[model samples]
Target: AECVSNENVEIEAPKTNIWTSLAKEEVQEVLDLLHSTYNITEVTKADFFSNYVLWIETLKPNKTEALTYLDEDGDLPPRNARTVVYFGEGEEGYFEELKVGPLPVSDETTIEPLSFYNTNGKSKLPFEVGHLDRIKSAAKSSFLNKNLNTTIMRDVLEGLIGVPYEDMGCHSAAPQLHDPATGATVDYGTCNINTENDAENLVPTGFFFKFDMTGRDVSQWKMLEYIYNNKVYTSAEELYEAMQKDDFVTLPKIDVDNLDWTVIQRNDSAPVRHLDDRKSPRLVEPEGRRWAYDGDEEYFSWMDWGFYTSWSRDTGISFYDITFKGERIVYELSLQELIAEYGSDDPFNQHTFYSDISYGVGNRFSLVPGYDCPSTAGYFTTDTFEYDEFYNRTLSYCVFENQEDYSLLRHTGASYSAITQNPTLNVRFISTIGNYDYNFLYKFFLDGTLEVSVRAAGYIQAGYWNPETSAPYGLKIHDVLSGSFHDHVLNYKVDLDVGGTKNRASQYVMKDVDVEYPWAPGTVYNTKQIAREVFENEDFNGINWPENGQGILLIESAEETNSFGNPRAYNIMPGGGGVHRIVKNSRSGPETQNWARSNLFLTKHKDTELRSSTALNTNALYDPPVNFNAFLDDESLDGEDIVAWVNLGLHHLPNSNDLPNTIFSTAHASFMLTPFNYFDSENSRDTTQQVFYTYDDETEESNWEFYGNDWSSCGVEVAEPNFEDYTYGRGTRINKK
Candidate 1:
């Protein structure tokens, strides 16, 4: 049978996407302004004596301005560019944010300090003295070649791991260890016995070296300490002297040839399933793609759902102007911060608290077509600015429709039955930050439900195994590796526009109550009642989930109500058991991430209050650029535009199953937003994919009824993705199956 090809579901955007990133021409012109005015040179073209551009991206417009243009039909919001530059001309070089544009390079355009969004008042932050030079290249060489490559140090590593420097791999954590005094910073580099696969993180060599890469003067940079087998040495000479003693403890080397357990590829290790020769079944869009998308504006609409997408250097893909059934439900939904905190017996692992944004979570990898997303999925290209140029990444985001196996709504009776198919549109992206890959998904359901989920899959960062100390902190995963315990706390900024901008933070608390009914005369029966209340002030901010999951938080339209006289609202709850940071007063300190302290929070919307944390938040121990705690100042929440700061997290204690790599199936967290008292009836009733069957008992005949569903016969073709045709740029490209 011959299959017919289909075109992509495309449309023209109703309005310009105000949140879209600046165009390449606009970005280049802004770069030109900075080059001439501030002496900003491209990173590759600049010397240590000249200032250079570090990062550049869009400066999002204020919510007030966006609403005026989007809802009130006011003039378009001015486009601007936010650029980060290293002030090499200063006595002590620092990083400062500069806001440029009124876009298209008009005569009135000017550049100035972009500090309004930063609560710290001053946007200037100390640039890591040798970060661009060290973290980029020199730090690894300083520890490997300059220090550990010595004759004595190489002998010690070979005795422990049976590998030369060429077969050994070393890596240092980023947003490195900082010192409040003298602004000195340190980097702890760990060595791993290299294997054929990227399994270095799963195998530890039981060695760590610290270097004070604080200044640009390479001569002044020196190794601070050496760690071997849970022992700390003040100097390399001390380590050599200790190794000479027979009492020094040393771990046995792993067998280099028998490292099959570290390999991630599928091989002859599992039981074969029935019909293994034939390929498995897959999903296909019989009537072509159901969603309409505008690539230039990043606008998407499908089955009563509409929204625009945005990506940045810090938080990744975000949705703006999310509308349901021709009405706005959410103004914006974006990731704010991602925190991965680790705890272990060793000094290196214990101090490993990674604020992933510092490494650019928005920095994405080209997704594997058939594995990362559906082969028949549509793709979007996202751009990022670095080193004074715009770089486009292809297959960064994908949109696809999936039909669940189970029925969305089903009812069976004596003679009649009703069934509806469950279909959902999903938009996703993956960010491989450091050793872990985070798969972020935003799903839209026909029932007016939106779900945001994050699943992690990658190598488990393990520490060297030691029974006495390491066993207490984590489980031994390999011969010389222990899976360190860590918490993955991710925060999101949800701006709900229920009816209009004015909303209320409300809750429905379920409590057991005694009630007497007229039918049950004097007897009082135990029952549960929903106690509804709206928080009037910000004192209720940073509130946690109720005990035993007995309450639901909601964003209710202040003056809007349904036909039944109930307040229109959207309910927010854990889609699959959300978790907050487990450790109270975590070692990272409240100053670093105060947002991690609770499950969810409610705060009045403010132009100045945007993100929860900054990329350089880890660099400042005492004072952070964006402090979440400051957003909560006992402000009025009643009848005001409110934002929900929700956290989705995972507390992972890896075991043998997590050896090769952590599976996305288990390492997941998600939150859902569904309509609550916002619609008169469920929204799924509008879908045509439902069926009804009835039996005429008198005649003993059965009849079936369909609701506008397509029953046309068509052929489907299953083929592989065009691997060689993959290229980078902007636009919507769909695979016709």
Candidate 2:
């Protein structure tokens, strides 16, 4: 808290990191405590629909509840009891929340059934039998690959499939299209059952199934419809008869017949020198470290920037209390959700796999050098709370200051020359779910600009083609592979406090019109200028990057303006090409995923609407857990605390080379929050990392100037940390639950 103090004013420590996840030990103790109360058996193994912890969901508290408490002291906010899996599932299913303590088994630890974080007061867990039985029913049908039907699948699906049942490309759109009157909630999705094609590419096989697994009963779990080769059938018997009908009239089974792009063989692709080029560049850090850190609090500072770091099971790497030049600029900057929605003829393709549900931010993430982050990065360990314990995990957060390879501004004049480099301090984390690995980065610039981006690497979730459809969905990359076209939309919450929490959104629009100047009568020119507005309510909040990029969104302090009394603000702009979900009001799921339907959204900031979306939403897709659409409610946007929910996305249509792995280049999306009129000047000039020259025309010679501790001025003596002894596991206890 002392470190967070500015000169005249001081901001006290927050009563709690509302986003803090339960300690794994805390989770285990809660489970242990629940064991007796619920008369539960060991969590390691269980019955037909036995109980277990799906995940320790971090129930976000009301924002004002946390802020007002933090806005002062000892007012250590009241604990409202965090949430956990209260599964009695089958024999008297007891799904309630538990209130664990200031933990490590306090005598006061208590376990009970009552809704905690979620105010909606609804059942949190869906019967596993519904999904399990649905998958079981699909496996039983002759429509699926026999190779995939393992014995454990007949019982459990844990050990065998490298991919989850969700990743198999078996998409089901039952609720998306159901007629509530008929209660005709039929789940429709295809089983693109896949395999290891020696391409290391786990491709999905084209097959389909339909299930009526709506309610909670294994007996009622029925396969009502089926499809194969474009033919629809009512039952297993009906489908077999139609198969012999027309050989299941389908398109020519496409084949690649090419291994050139697979993996191994490569010609002298560019030049002998391109192959001869194996030289790696050297980046030397002469000074031990330029960045400052406090291992005690896990906070970091570099130049004019300072922020605290946090690790959680939900979205591993998060930062809070971001201040620049000793003033709070942002309250928190964290990834809220990662939504990967797919569309194909199969149910699996209809998959809107919420990775956070299965493999959240901090769960199984590990960051290494060069590849994961710059080799010269200043690294730090992060902590995760669990099982009545506090464990500081490995080097999960990497912060590095890197200057762009290209100059930010370069100009050569007869009189003078000026060049500036784009320097950025990056905080990054990597999370992987199944085949794809996503690198999420927070880039802070020398100017008051900040960028949050997500880049995807790792294997593309490809679909297998024994026989194929019209080459419309994706490209054929291998003999039996189709590069699955999908959308990766990662939503981020920028709880920007601008100068303070009472901020309003301003939109600047460029208008083209006819006009005549005072000096030139009746003469019109192709001229344009901007028109501005203070966004009124949530109704006008959906933002699409304007045509010709003519509109801009800014979060400005209505109370604090600059010298000319203009609102001090920051512009939120998409850095590269960004896209929203391709399927709109999708028959698969509508009101649930409203966040993905737009590139940007703004809503009145309230503690109740902390997250853009929740992981539990995936579990309860129909009605949804955290209805983001509910957050809007046409709330008044007049100078209230506002939150900007921005989307970073890629409508990935993978090509032939996407086999083996998807490159980070092709599938990527990002948005940047830059100083619009906030600083009102060339703020980056305040940095010493720039150059200037004078009078070069006459003799082609100019006076030169350099910045402090200039690297070009020094040479030699450089050493790297001992990676020789480093070998992964350095004793960070992780979650197996």
Candidate 3:
């Protein structure tokens, strides 16, 4: 027998331009029409069923046109060019004509292997019995265990019951058992024996009845009713019951001899499937096309020369040829070429001095080179001293005889003027001759008497405020001279600038005012010497200087007088008396004198009252001159110089007691005083006052010591020594100078 084979094939063709000249507006109009015509509104169930009648009538003709278009153009026809026709509803009487083809015998055999076998005397087979059986068992078990769990036995029995014995042949068996069985005969339990051959009685009620059982609890009798209504068996109910009870055992006869059979053996060793043609599909047009690049002489030239040279030269290039043989010269210049030919190698050539040098010899001295030199001789004579006169006002000038000199001097003058005018000025007096000292004098005359005067001298010493060592202690020299002095030194006084009674006397004197010494140029001078002169006669007496002593000494007698008769005597002792008398009569006794003599007298006093009186006594006569050497040996003797240096060590003794409570003693001596001593603790203890001391930690001594005689019972003992207060000041003071 000859076999016919059908090949799987597809048609492919390039789309032709249908609107080559159509305007965009025309194209859009057509597209809009097509879109509107194809737009299908979703149909409601009522509308869908009603319209389906019309749809079915139109579907055949529409599908004919679509098939014709698909065959010719190898593409889908226009939308709405085909219609779909559906019948019935739900799971019953629903018939659909799906485009299904016969399954390949090879695939059928692979999927349902037992479809080729036979269990009865018949040699032919239908659907694979084993596969059908497996599918039916799975379906029944799943439905019974899950959806029909409450009706398990009933649903299972209904699925098995009344299936036609002849339909149980492999192919028809599974389909007959599929949901909503519709292809059963009257011999099945679903058909009555009387209506077995009646065509009108073969209604679609079975499909409808099976669909109604979709969500029903078909347990017990209902399962039997569903099976009977579905017509799962082709025989009458009486015949099905007899068949299940084995009343008839003869197998049905089947003739498959006339059916053609062919073994479809898969060629596992066959060569792999390949494309029908090895060549690529040909393009529709060869001419009138946009060519990327054609293999032509001009195209090659453009690629190699026109675009290539331009782009390559702009981006990069390789050197190949040299033209040494040319009659003329040929050169290739780079950035280095121009630089090597003319540019200077020096990095700062633009700013060099040589660039500004005059080119010609005669231009050297001319203010404008090559112009007339006006008055080469000195027009202003030395006798005229015009420069000197200028110096009086300008203080300094830079003469630029040459252009270079002019440039240099211009900068120097500008800098010097800025430094002088902007801040306090420093005038440098340069002389053509030897070093000369110039006096700076300012004179003022008052119509009335000048009562008070204050002068503060400040110097800018070298290495002072130096970056290496000097930390400015809030001292500003210029500010000090401008009546802003803040650091007070000994022997300096500032008069309150108030008028009236405060300005009584004139002719104030500041003596021994040495402005220069030790503070020579280049030496660091930290100490500031400040002197203020108050012309008031009251102020002259205010400073109680000892008149009798040449160099701060105590007067020996009451009748003593200074050379000018200004009362040379000042009784620093508590009582007024000659030195010997005060020493012998004071309550502090000779011991106090010993302390005073050791501190005040520059020379050792061998006849201190204690020593002299003791020597004269009969009881002390054997005591070997009372050994004044012991007093002399005391280190407190050195305090005399300190007392004299600080004018009897006088302090303001402020009434307030906010000061710290520490004993203050002069180095090497125990001369002490407490401002709070005036108040007796029993009567009026001045809790407001506290005594402080000054001590020299380096020397292990004090400038003043407090005895604490009055504070004995108060349990207020003196604290251990702290040198910080003595070295510095205890409280803030107004620094007048």
Candidate 4:
């Protein structure tokens, strides 16, 4: 540990000795430089004193200086002085050497001067250059480990600004100098003449400078650049002005609205268009319209007509044929003759032929039984026909619109007669016809909204003759059978309104023997029975029940009897029981009597005796024997054992005074010696013979009474050991002399 000197200046080793060799002016210069570099304007005299003290503490007080002459043979005046600073002696020396050098050649290229020392005639020791590199590395390591210690901050800054020292410029306070004055000390004391070079080298490396500082020559622009780069402006506005003057790079403004750079426009092509006539020669446009043109006119007629007249004729002819000359036909007939010829046949069909002719002169339309002609006919006629005699036979023949023309016709023959025979010509015919013809008529009225009745039938009554025994054939009870038949018959009437016009007419004539019989109670009953049989025996149980589980009825068994004498087994108990039948018996005569007498004779008697005895004893008193020895003895019975013995003594008395007189006297006598009996029963009882006796003082005799004794034989006694003496001989054996 020593100090080295160059020329007229001396440099001390870092920890060995203090470099108090500098005058006060020099110290003041160093302080001023520190203040200027750190931008510490508010520092007081105390701050300077503290700083001086710190500087002093950094130097070792007791150490020598290794002197070397600048003009010596091989020393070369020590152009750049170097001093080795050591911490301690160990396996490896914790030390570093600081070399003072000339200023850097440029701000971009820092200068590092190397030192050379002569070791021997043929060997030379080269001291390391780049002392500032070591200092910068140490400062960076310290900053990385201390202030910017978190990996998260490191990663974020690295990602945003790139690796700081490698990709961007980074500088630390370690290599920075406040003023050229402090830097001159290194130059002067270390025999370094280039103060500017030394200061430039002290400028932190890896930091970018706007102005070039290549040589020792100082420029005002370079100083201004450094001040502008390092000085902290008051506000962002000021900083921004400086930045503008410095010409820092800036980001371009982004256009948010034109994000995708798409030019939008509306499509003007026609979505739909009509083409000119290609095949149709009749296609035409109106003359006054903008896109109108005229082509050949097209027409459709019943025969052949032109333009609008063609359409009118075609529709008119179709309507006329359907309205008048279609499959539907109307004919006039004399009612008397019609009935005479057709007999029981539906007069509606016979009188109303296809036309008013015998066979061929008129439209020879067959009475297609199931279908109504006009109702079934559309634009095309359906020639297919089916004749239903049953439906046709019951068809009514009367002009419903002209109800005055209607009449009833019956067969007069004694035997059942066909429509063609036994006919009576009784008919009523209307003179005028109206619009709308009825193809088929239902006797009963349904929803009249039905425009045409087809595949329909009519009903009528025949056996409606009244007997003299009743009021009349229609009114008598016995003849009510026929009356009921008449009532059941349904009749129908057609109106010209069946069609839209009143000029057309229709008819529905009901014949004889078509009534529905009234249902009797017997028949209803029979129907219900059948339904029940189907549901119970056939439909439900007979089929579904077998597929499921066998039906288990939740019923009581007639063979089993309950405790109450009821004919039901498996009775549930009200509450749990011990062994006996669990169910409760009904309180009938005998049970009620027995319970009452038992409660009175057994319960009441014992209860009354207990109450009487308790009342007597309420005032009665008995004094127990007083024994001072027993009271003081520790071996005496404990209160708990005595209570147990007392309970046992109580058993010597009968629980009820209602006990037989003999037993009662015996118990009363036994209770005379209750105290002695209590102790003897519990304490004197043997290990095997558990019993005790008491005297019968009430009988003036020593009664042999036992406590807690079963009624088997005479009571046995037991001897008790003296526990007090036994305590001393607990583990000792007794000797038999």
Q: Output the number of the lDDT-best candidate.
A: 1
Better of 1 and 2 by TM-score: 1
**Which residue pairs in candidate 1 collide?**
none
Off by over 4 Å in 2: 1-29, 57-62, 65-74, 78-81, 89-119, 128-202, 212-220, 223-226, 233-277, 351-359, 382-393, 408-418, 464-468, 694-703, 710-737
lDDT of 2 by residue, 642-714 (tens): 8888888888887765656678876667888887767667577776767887875668776778666344444
Tell me the TM-score of model 1. 0.94
Off by over 4 Å in 4: 1-83, 86-136, 144-737
Candidate 3 — which residues are off by over 4 angstroms? 1-12, 15-143, 146-173, 177-737
Q: What is the descending lDDT order?
A: 1, 2, 3, 4
Highest TM-score: give the candidate number: 1
Q: Write the per-residue lDDT of candidate 1 for residues 1-737, one digit (tens) a residue.
A: 43456688779888998898767777778878887787765555555456877766789899888888987888888888888777768677777888987898889899888888777877787755223332246434654587778888888777767888789887675446667667787777788778777787877776887888775455677888888777788887788888889897777666676888887887877878888969767788776788989988999998889999998867779999999889989898999889888888876787777788876787657777877888778888787776655767778789989897788899999899999998899999988876799999998999899999999989988888887688878998777779999999999999998999899988999999999999989999999999898888886448888888999889999999999998899999786647787777644444778888788888999889888888768767566787788898999999999999999999999998797889999888898999999998898997988899999899999988888665667687776864654643332322110
> What ranking of all candidate models by TM-score puts the best one first?
1, 2, 3, 4
- Candidate 3, residues 79-196, lDDT tens digits: the string is 2111122222333322121211111112221111110111111211111111112222343334333322334323333334323322221111111221214422111112111112
lDDT tens readout by residue for model 4, 1-737: 22221221122211111111222233233333334333322212211112111110011111111112211222222122122222122232122323322111123321122112111111111111111223324433443333222454334223322243232223222112122222210000000001221121111111111221221112211211221222433332444455546455322211222212111222355353365324322211111111111111111111011111000100000001111111111110000000001111111111111110111110112222112211111111101100100011111121111111222222324322211111011111111111111122211111011121111111111111123221222221111112111100001111111111112110112222323337543332222111101011111101111112222111122233344553221111111100111112211111111111100010100101111111001001111011111121222211111100000001111112211111212221010011111111222122121222334546654433333333443322222222222121111211110
lDDT of residue 520 for candidate 3: 85
